[PDB]
Design an enzyme around this catalytic site. Sequence first.
Site, PDB file in Angstrom:
ATOM      1  CG  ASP A   7      15.180 -61.096 -14.787  1.00 45.53           C
ATOM      2  OD1 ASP A   7      14.422 -62.050 -14.493  1.00 45.53           O
ATOM      3  OD2 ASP A   7      15.431 -60.186 -13.969  1.00 45.53           O
ATOM      4  CG  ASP A  98      14.552 -64.740 -11.916  1.00 49.72           C
ATOM      5  OD1 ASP A  98      13.817 -64.688 -12.925  1.00 49.72           O
ATOM      6  OD2 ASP A  98      14.246 -64.233 -10.815  1.00 49.72           O
ATOM      7  CD  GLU A  99      18.838 -62.123 -12.092  1.00 53.88           C
ATOM      8  OE1 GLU A  99      17.880 -61.533 -12.622  1.00 53.88           O
ATOM      9  OE2 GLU A  99      19.278 -61.795 -10.969  1.00 53.88           O
TER      10      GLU A  99
END
Length: 336
Positions: A7, A98-99
């Site tokens: 993340d 983001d992840e």
Amino acid sequence: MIVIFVDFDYFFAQVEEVLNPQYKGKPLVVCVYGAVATANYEARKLGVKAGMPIIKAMQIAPSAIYVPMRKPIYEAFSNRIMNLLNKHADKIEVASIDEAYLDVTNKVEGNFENGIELARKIKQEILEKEKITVTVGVAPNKILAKIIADKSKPNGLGVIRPTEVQDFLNELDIDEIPGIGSVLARRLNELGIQKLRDILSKNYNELEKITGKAKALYLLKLAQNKYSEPVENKSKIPHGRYLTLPYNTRDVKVILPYLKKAINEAYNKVNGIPMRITVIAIMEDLDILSKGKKFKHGISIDNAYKVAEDLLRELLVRDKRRNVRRIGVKLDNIII
DNA sequence: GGGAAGCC
DNA sequence: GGCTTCCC
């Protein structure tokens, strides 16, 4: 299974700080129209949190910079970095800009210590090559890797070895179970269950009457440590574009060229094949009609033209009255 | 099916 | 906003 979950730390703001070094150390907040998008940590320590009106942001963080959101650069960074992660992984599921979830089991050949060392290597590389810092969690399934990542922010390397799993699953407040936010947490905490394993010594049936059969089951097999939905080679990142029509028409023989151009540039921002297509439309009064079809097999651009045409025609059959102003397309669920 | 309501 | 579950 060894799942390394990555993340990115307060992403947008950090793409900013990397681009403008003199942001590093002073509060920097990123905006969307106005409301807060991301926010770095010098800005966090002052009460700046995502989604709040910039109003409150300024009233409690006046020494803060305030930039607009340049998404294209953030997407540039996330793309470069996803390509970084694709090299150290056997399988990768991109959950957002983001992840990412990496199945690295054949890469460290089942050896968790080597997995942890790999995560170390990954952090070192990401920060060396793109000056960006991530929060990582290492675990045997996706959900725990994530829970330990969120528990390891910022710039952290969270860890839950097989040995630790059950233990962790015990001491684990219900509100820290992703899929349970605030209200369900309130109810269960106030109606009996405080922690995950407490779910076991209940009647299940009247747990479904609070959550729903699915999520209740999930809570079970997680409390039972019978959870292992595997890491899929997919991106959940949505890719699509909207185009304004010359006037407010309502005729497929005018819209179609504009929809076909929306599709072509949605089908170009995507490496891989989509499994969902959604036609979107902004009507006269800006009222929005969303309508998508799912495809277990991928959808070619060529067949995407026809399927979209049908989705549209079906929409205009749903409306009959109003006309169309803008046209849009979204492409989801992406195989890679 | 698909619009409406509630919960991340 | 998007996902589910409710409800017509």
